[PDB]
Design a protein around this motif. Structure first.
Motif, short mmCIF file in Angstrom:
data_model
loop_
_atom_site.label_atom_id
_atom_site.label_comp_id
_atom_site.label_asym_id
_atom_site.label_seq_id
_atom_site.Cartn_x
_atom_site.Cartn_y
_atom_site.Cartn_z
N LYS A 1 -2.66 13.91 7.37
CA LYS A 1 -1.68 14.41 6.46
C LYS A 1 -0.81 13.34 5.93
N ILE A 2 -0.53 12.31 6.75
CA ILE A 2 0.38 11.20 6.30
C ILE A 2 -0.32 10.42 5.20
N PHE A 3 -1.62 10.14 5.39
CA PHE A 3 -2.35 9.37 4.36
C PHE A 3 -2.42 10.12 3.05
N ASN A 4 -2.65 11.45 3.11
CA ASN A 4 -2.59 12.34 1.91
C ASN A 4 -1.28 12.23 1.17
N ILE A 5 -0.18 12.26 1.91
CA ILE A 5 1.14 12.06 1.34
C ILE A 5 1.25 10.68 0.64
N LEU A 6 0.75 9.64 1.27
CA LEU A 6 0.91 8.32 0.68
C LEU A 6 0.14 8.23 -0.66
N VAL A 7 -1.06 8.84 -0.69
CA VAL A 7 -1.92 8.91 -1.89
C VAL A 7 -1.27 9.82 -2.96
N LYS A 8 -0.92 11.06 -2.61
CA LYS A 8 -0.20 11.99 -3.49
C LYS A 8 1.03 11.32 -4.13
N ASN A 9 1.80 10.55 -3.35
CA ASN A 9 3.05 9.95 -3.78
C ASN A 9 2.80 8.66 -4.52
N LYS A 10 1.56 8.27 -4.81
CA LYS A 10 1.29 7.00 -5.53
C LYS A 10 1.58 5.74 -4.80
N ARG A 11 1.67 5.78 -3.48
CA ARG A 11 1.87 4.54 -2.70
C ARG A 11 0.54 4.01 -2.08
N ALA A 12 -0.53 4.74 -2.27
CA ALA A 12 -1.84 4.35 -1.74
C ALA A 12 -2.89 4.97 -2.59
N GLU A 13 -4.17 4.56 -2.42
CA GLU A 13 -5.27 5.38 -2.97
C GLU A 13 -6.42 5.22 -1.96
N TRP A 14 -7.35 6.17 -1.99
CA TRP A 14 -8.53 6.19 -1.09
C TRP A 14 -9.51 5.10 -1.44
N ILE A 15 -9.83 4.25 -0.47
CA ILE A 15 -11.05 3.42 -0.54
C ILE A 15 -12.22 4.25 -0.08
N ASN A 16 -12.07 4.93 1.07
CA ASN A 16 -13.08 5.87 1.55
C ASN A 16 -12.42 6.89 2.42
N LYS A 17 -12.40 8.14 1.94
CA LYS A 17 -11.63 9.14 2.61
C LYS A 17 -12.32 9.61 3.89
N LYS A 18 -13.64 9.60 3.89
CA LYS A 18 -14.35 10.08 5.09
C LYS A 18 -14.20 9.08 6.27
N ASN A 19 -13.77 7.87 5.94
CA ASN A 19 -13.46 6.81 6.95
C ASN A 19 -11.94 6.65 7.14
N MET A 20 -11.17 7.54 6.51
CA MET A 20 -9.71 7.41 6.58
C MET A 20 -9.24 5.97 6.26
N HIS A 21 -9.59 5.51 5.04
CA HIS A 21 -9.43 4.12 4.68
C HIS A 21 -8.73 4.15 3.33
N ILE A 22 -7.56 3.52 3.26
CA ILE A 22 -6.77 3.56 2.04
C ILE A 22 -6.46 2.20 1.53
N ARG A 23 -6.27 2.11 0.20
CA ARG A 23 -5.66 0.90 -0.33
C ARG A 23 -4.15 1.17 -0.54
N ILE A 24 -3.31 0.23 -0.13
CA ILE A 24 -1.87 0.25 -0.42
C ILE A 24 -1.65 -0.18 -1.90
N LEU A 25 -0.84 0.60 -2.64
CA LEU A 25 -0.51 0.35 -4.06
C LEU A 25 0.87 -0.26 -4.04
N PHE A 26 1.09 -1.37 -4.78
CA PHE A 26 2.40 -2.11 -4.80
C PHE A 26 3.28 -1.65 -5.96
N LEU A 27 4.59 -1.57 -5.72
CA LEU A 27 5.53 -1.15 -6.75
C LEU A 27 6.49 -2.28 -7.11
N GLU A 28 6.93 -3.02 -6.10
CA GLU A 28 7.86 -4.13 -6.32
C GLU A 28 7.50 -5.32 -5.44
#
Length: 173
Positions: free
Chosen positions: A146-173
């Motif tokens: 659920k935390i990773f979903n929130i990070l993706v939903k909120n534009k702070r991450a995106e999925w590299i591979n969701k079935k592996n629970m693997h995210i990319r961090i998105l930078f803002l500043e």
């Protein structure tokens, strides 16, 4: 207040009335408030997120309660009503104490990833950490989903591979 600062938890022999369940309605509400506030603090200060009720019954000062089973079931009922707790499943053997919600966990984790220079995160890398701010590395697998979903939903991450629970961090500043 009869006693302050949960001083009754520090020396159970000196406060033995805190360890009997009262039967009078008025007394039982005030006892329950004291134990519910204590138990929320004990999880928070110990940075613990969950634990079986039998294990809780081995810990000071819970270990000094009479009718451990009945006393814990009403404290837990009270923490559930106050929106700080849920049973983990339908067997009612373990509790999950939410002294922090997922939205705050997601900022704690994001800030830690930035501060540590990580550009990707996986569930596995997090649960294998030696240590982490407020023991986030100990959160149950379902909470990470659920935390990773929130990070993706909120534009702070995106999925590299969701079935592996693997995210990319998105930078803002």
């Amino acid at each position: 207040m009869l006693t302050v600062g949960f001083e009754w938890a520090a020396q159970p022999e000196k406060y033995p009335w805190m360890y009997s369940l009262p039967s009078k309605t008025e007394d039982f509400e005030d006892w329950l408030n004291q134990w519910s506030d204590f138990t929320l603090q004990w999880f928070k200060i110990n940075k613990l997120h969950q634990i079986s009720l039998v294990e809780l019954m081995g810990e000071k000062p819970f270990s000094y309660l009479q009718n451990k089973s009945k006393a814990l079931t009403v404290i837990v009922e009270n923490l559930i009503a106050r929106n700080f707790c849920k049973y983990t499943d339908k067997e009612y053997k373990s509790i999950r104490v939410f002294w922090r919600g997922y939205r705050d966990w997601s900022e704690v984790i994001y800030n830690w990833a930035l501060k540590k220079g990580r550009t990707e995160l996986t569930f596995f890398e997090i649960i294998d950490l030696k240590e982490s701010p407020d023991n986030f590395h100990m959160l149950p697998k379902e909470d990470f989903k659920k935390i990773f979903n929130i990070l993706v939903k909120n534009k702070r991450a995106e999925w590299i591979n969701k079935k592996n629970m693997h995210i990319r961090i998105l930078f803002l500043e």
